[PDB]
RNA sequence: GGGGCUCGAAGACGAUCAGAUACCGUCCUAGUCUCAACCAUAAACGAUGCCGACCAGGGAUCGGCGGAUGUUGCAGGACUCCGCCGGCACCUUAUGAGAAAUCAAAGUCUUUGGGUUCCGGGGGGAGUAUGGUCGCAAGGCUGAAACUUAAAGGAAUUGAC
């Protein structure tokens, strides 16, 4: 834990996750990021967000748009 | 429909139990398959193989189909059944019965941290069945099951989420492979970790603390 | 065993043999458990007992009788006899 | 040959087990009792059963056999509880002690027991 | 009763005699060996060993599931009683395999305790009790395996006096512990001795 | 010939432990054996043990408490730095939650967690868990 | 070089057999015995390298030693009982191992590490070709490749014979 080559990139990894909407504000530990899964990433795609924002009739209409 | 024939089943049928961990606690020899039906809520059943074995008689070859079945909800309970019968239907049914009869508990530990819902075997555990030796080693939270199809099915039914597996010997032999996997899953609850060695307290066995209703109230 | 909250996570806590301390597996069908009742000064069973558990290994060894005898001699000292 | 089928053996054993009170030694009496105490279709099977029952009465009139039960000596209970003498067979005086047992009674036991002997 | 009376009685019943040899067990029970090779097994330890056995067996208050077994045809009379003096059951002579493991057998009866005349004679019930978590008590002599029997009383199982007197003494102290025998004397004059 | 008394001691102790014995005898004794036993006892894996002076090499009588699963030496005594301990932990130990590796560092004989605490390395004597 | 009884590779004859350079009979040479030199191989086997520690029980036996014991047509010798060390083995049982047969070591192995030597990598070709080297020779030690092949093999099981 007291290793700087753990603290620095642990902070960086958590910062990237909290920046991309993957980890929640209640998951600020290096253990939660090990529990990530593919659908977490696929939920942040622009097509997925366009579909879920109500702008597209379907997730294929979102990709077409 | 069901008339219990043993003390444990006669004790279960009216509802003197909630789970089956107390039966494990006293290592009671479960011998009726409706006990696990009543106690364990969820049971799933997939047959693994239907191998035709043969015995050469003077006339011809008498063939019998032997079926392998794996039982257990993915929450720490798993069992294995093997049954050889004249035709596949009775083999499958009897193997299901035996698998349900052979349910054992598995111990799930953590890799390096105690964030809830344990997901891994606690220690390095091995199991040998003839020649097939299988080893499972703890894995981090996101690893998943690293094993062949057979140990993967057994561990999925056991409730394990991540593990690192190895193998040695003729793993093509399905019977020995799956028996070694299940056997070492039993051993997972056998290692003496430093946490377990708090001094033990003793509790009356079901045969001893239910003596009042077991002297001569035969079936009423 | 213990979660970060501080709760149980395993299904149950097993028994361990009172002679060799090795734990008793849920499929150990040679493992037994003996309740030795205690008496009063007159020699009347008072309804309380001391419980011992023996694993299948120590039984199959043949040292179950010696281990149980030694355990009883050691244990009766605290609670008189 | 002349050996008896398990059916006739079994039925003879049962009729003797439950109807030893009146049934007699003659074969014809045995069969005339069998015809109404049990339903046997074949007449010659009935004859075989009656003859077999007669043979076992010959067997039993000398002593008990391993087949039948009820009134469990042959007809009357209380055979061995009457073998209780007015004095116990176990004596207490000069009771069979040798040199090494004398050394034992010199050990934790009491060397002045009532039954100690110099033998 | 007082240990002196029981000790002198088993001295009368020749319960202290051993065999020409012993196994690597029971040296905790022997005293020494005679010049002829016989063993002189210390009755003193036997007394409180069967006393602790009595403590064990009056602890379950449901004597129905206590089978006393005797394969040898020499101690059948003793096992015949000790089953109505107490509430225990008793199977004499022949023990059909499967009565402790086969749940479809007509004679299926799983106990909480087994009492055996001799571990050498009826080893089959011992091996079968090993598959059901059945605690076992036997009257082991020298040259008797300790393989699965859990409480072993060091007595003789080849004598008319030894068996019978020993069984009666056990039953007497068991009834005493149960409280039925308030301080008194024997009302069960020796009947179990062989005819 | 007796080339490593530590292996004989550990093997005899482990063999006695598997058989359910309550005491074990170790002959001959030595200072490194005493230090290994002291570490094991401090972590709570054995109990009492007494050294008997026979004027030649000494014996040890050790009291077992049933808590020791396995204990064994590593031969030859490979040299490990502070950065390699993790690797050996992944090899000789059941899991990261418990278990111990014994190192003979220049600060003395200790376990691997203490070596990480003091940030020192050395050779590997054995392991126990 | 001596010796050379018996037995007996080679050889001859008789017999059996469709055939019998074999099995069965008889006569026999080198050999079998020994001395002085060569060879260096065997199912040279416990098919199990040597040294060390630990881990079940039992009885018998061989050598030495300690103790007790009470008999010899005679302290000691013979005999009986107990114990210690060393050896050849044997019996029972895994709680051990192993594919199993089986093994008290072939155990203390995925919970893998006491020291050290030799040595194996699917079956053939093949212990063959050639080179080197020892030998009078027969031969020994070292020892391939091209090519071919999907099995060869171990233990146990049920039938059939
Ligand atoms: Mg060779
Ligand atoms: Mg000698
Ligand atoms: Mg090859």
Automatic annotation (TrEMBL), chain A:
Similarity comment: Belongs to the universal ribosomal protein uS4 family.
UniProt source species: Triticum aestivum (Wheat)
Taxonomic lineage: Eukaryota, Viridiplantae, Streptophyta, Embryophyta, Tracheophyta
Signal peptide annotation: none
Role of this protein: With S5 and S12 plays an important role in translational accuracy.
Range covered out of full length: 66 to 130 of 195
GO biological process, one term: ribosomal small subunit biogenesis
GO MF entries: rRNA binding; structural constituent of ribosome
Quaternary structure and partners: Part of the 30S ribosomal subunit. Contacts protein S5. The interaction surface between S4 and S5 is involved in control of translational fidelity.
Superkingdom as given in the UniProt entry: Eukaryota
Keywords from the named record: Ribonucleoprotein, Ribosomal protein, RNA-binding, rRNA-binding
Gene name of the record: LOC123102726
GO cellular component, one term: cytosolic small ribosomal subunit
Protein name: 30S ribosomal protein S4, chloroplastic
UniProtKB/TrEMBL annotation, chain B:
Sequence ranges assigned to domain S5 DRBM in this UniProt record: 43-106
Ribonucleoprotein in keyword set: yes
Gene Ontology terms: cellular component: cytosolic small ribosomal subunit
GO biological process: translation
MF (Gene Ontology): mRNA binding; structural constituent of ribosome
Keywords: Ribonucleoprotein, Ribosomal protein
Statement: the UniProt record of this protein carries the keyword Repeat: no
Family: Belongs to the universal ribosomal protein uS5 family.
Stated name of the protein: S5 DRBM domain-containing protein
Automatic annotation (TrEMBL), chain C:
Gene3D superfamilies: 3.30.1230.20
Cellular component GO terms, alphabetical: cytosolic small ribosomal subunit; nucleus
Classification via InterPro entries: Ribosomal_eS21 (IPR001931), Ribosomal_eS21_CS (IPR018279), Ribosomal_eS21_sf (IPR038579)
Entry protein name: 40S ribosomal protein S21
GO molecular function annotation: structural constituent of ribosome
Family stated for the protein in its record: Belongs to the eukaryotic ribosomal protein eS21 family.
Record bears the keyword Protease: no
GO biological process, one term: endonucleolytic cleavage to generate mature 3'-end of SSU-rRNA from (SSU-rRNA, 5.8S rRNA, LSU-rRNA)
Organism domain of life: Eukaryota
Sorted UniProt keywords: Ribonucleoprotein, Ribosomal protein
UniProtKB/TrEMBL annotation, chain E:
Function: Required for the assembly and/or stability of the 40S ribosomal subunit. Required for the processing of the 20S rRNA-precursor to mature 18S rRNA in a late step of the maturation of 40S ribosomal subunits.
Family: Belongs to the universal ribosomal protein uS2 family.
GO CC entries: cytosolic small ribosomal subunit
UniProt protein name: Small ribosomal subunit protein uS2
Assembly information from the UniProt record: Component of the small ribosomal subunit. Mature ribosomes consist of a small (40S) and a large (60S) subunit. The 40S subunit contains about 33 different proteins and 1 molecule of RNA (18S). The 60S subunit contains about 49 different proteins and 3 molecules of RNA (25S, 5.8S and 5S). Interacts with ribosomal protein S21.
GO molecular function: structural constituent of ribosome
Subcellular location: Cytoplasm
Keyword field: Cytoplasm, Ribonucleoprotein, Ribosomal protein
GO biological process, one term: ribosomal small subunit assembly
Gene name of the record: LOC123187941
Shown stretch of the complete protein: 12 to 206 of 304
């Amino acid at each position: 834990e007291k290793n700087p080559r753990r603290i620095f990139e642990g902070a960086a990894l958590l910062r990237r996750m909290n920046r991309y909407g993957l980890l929640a504000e209640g998951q600020d530990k290096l253990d939660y990021v090990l529990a990530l899964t593919a659908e977490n990433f696929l939920a942040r795609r622009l097509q997925t967000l366009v579909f879920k924002a109500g702008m597209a009739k379907s997730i294929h209409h979102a990709r077409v748009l | 429909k069901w008339v219990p024939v043993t003390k444990l089943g006669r004790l279960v049928k009216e509802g003197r139990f909630t789970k089956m961990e107390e039966i494990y606690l006293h290592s009671l020899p479960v011998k009726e398959h409706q006990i696990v039906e009543t106690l364990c809520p969820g049971l799933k059943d997939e047959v693994m193989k239907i191998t035709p074995v043969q015995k050469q008689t003077r006339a011809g070859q008498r063939t019998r189909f032997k079926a392998f079945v794996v039982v257990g909800d993915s929450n720490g309970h798993v069992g294995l059944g093997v049954k050889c019968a004249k035709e596949v239907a009775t083999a499958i049914r009897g193997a299901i019965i035996l698998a349900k009869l052979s349910i054992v508990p598995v111990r799930r530990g953590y890799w390096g941290n105690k964030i809830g819902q344990p997901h891994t075997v606690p220690c390095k555990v091995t199991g040998k069945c003839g020649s097939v030796t299988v080893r499972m080693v703890p894995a981090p939270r996101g690893s998943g099951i690293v094993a062949a199809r057979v140990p993967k099915k057994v561990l999925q039914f056991a409730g394990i989420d991540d593990v690192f597996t190895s193998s040695r010997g003729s793993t093509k032999t399905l019977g020995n492979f799956v028996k070694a996997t299940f056997d070492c899953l039993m051993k997972t609850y056998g290692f003496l970790t430093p946490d377990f060695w708090r001094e033990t307290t003793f509790t009356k066995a079901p045969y001893q603390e239910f003596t009042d209703i077991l002297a001569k109230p035969t079936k009423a | 065993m213990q979660n970060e909250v501080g709760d149980m996570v395993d299904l149950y806590v097993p028994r361990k043999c009172s002679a060799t301390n090795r734990i008793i597996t849920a499929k150990d069908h040679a493992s037994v458990q003996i309740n030795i009742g205690h008496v009063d000064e007159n020699g009347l069973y008072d309804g309380r007992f001391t419980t011992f558990a023996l694993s299948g290994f120590v039984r199959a060894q043949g040292d179950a009788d010696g281990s149980l005898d030694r355990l009883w001699q050691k244990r009766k000292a605290e609670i008189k006899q | 040959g002349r050996v008896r089928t398990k059916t006739v053996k079994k039925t003879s054993r049962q009729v003797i087990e439950k109807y030893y009170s009146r049934m007699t030694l003659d074969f014809h009496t045995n069969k005339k009792v069998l015809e109404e105490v049990s339903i046997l279709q074949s007449k010659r099977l009935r004859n075989k059963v009656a003859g077999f029952t007669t043979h076992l009465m010959r067997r039993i009139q000398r002593g008990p056999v391993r087949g039948i039960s009820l009134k469990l000596q042959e007809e009357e209970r209380e055979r061995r509880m009457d073998f209780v003498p007015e004095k116990s067979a176990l004596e207490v005086d000069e009771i069979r002690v040798d040199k090494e047992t004398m050394d034992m009674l010199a050990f934790l036991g009491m060397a002045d027991l009532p039954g100690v002997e110099r033998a | 009763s007082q240990r002196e009376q029981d000790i002198q009685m088993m001295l009368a019943a020749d319960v202290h005699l051993g065999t020409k040899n012993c196994d690597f067990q029971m040296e905790r029970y022997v005293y020494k060996r005679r010049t002829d090779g016989i063993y002189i097994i210390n009755l003193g330890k036997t007394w409180e060993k069967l006393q602790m056995a009595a403590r064990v067996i009056v602890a379950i208050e449901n004597p129905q599931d206590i089978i006393v077994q005797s394969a040898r045809p020499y101690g059948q009379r003793a096992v015949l009683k000790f089953a109505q003096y107490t509430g225990a059951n008793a199977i004499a002579g022949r023990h059909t395999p499967g009565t402790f493991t086969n749940q479809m057998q007509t004679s299926f009866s799983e106990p909480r305790l087994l009492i055996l005349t001799d571990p050498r004679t009826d080893h089959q019930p011992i091996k079968e009790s090993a598959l059901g978590n059945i605690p076992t008590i036997a009257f082991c002599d020298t040259d008797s395996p300790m393989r699965y029997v859990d409480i072993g009383i060091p007595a003789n199982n080849k004598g008319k006096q030894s068996i019978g007197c020993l069984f009666w003494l056990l039953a007497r102290m068991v009834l005493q512990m149960r409280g039925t025998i308030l301080p008194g004397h024997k009302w069960e004059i020796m009947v179990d001795l062989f005819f | 010939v007796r080339v490593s008394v530590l292996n004989d001691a550990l093997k005899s102790m482990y063999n006695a432990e598997k058989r359910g014995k309550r005491q074990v005898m170790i002959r001959p004794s030595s200072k490194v054996i005493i230090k290994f036993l002291i570490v094991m006892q401090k972590h709570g894996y054995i109990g009492e043990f007494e050294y008997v002076d026979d004027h030649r090499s000494g014996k040890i009588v050790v009291e077992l408490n049933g808590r020791l699963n396995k204990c064994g030496v590593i031969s030859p005594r490979f040299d490990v730095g502070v950065k390699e301990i993790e690797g050996w932990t992944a090899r000789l130990l059941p899991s990261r939650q418990f278990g111990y590796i014994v190192l003979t560092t220049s600060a003395g004989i200790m376990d691997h967690e203490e070596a990480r605490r003091k940030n020192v390395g050395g050779k590997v004597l054995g392991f126990f868990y």
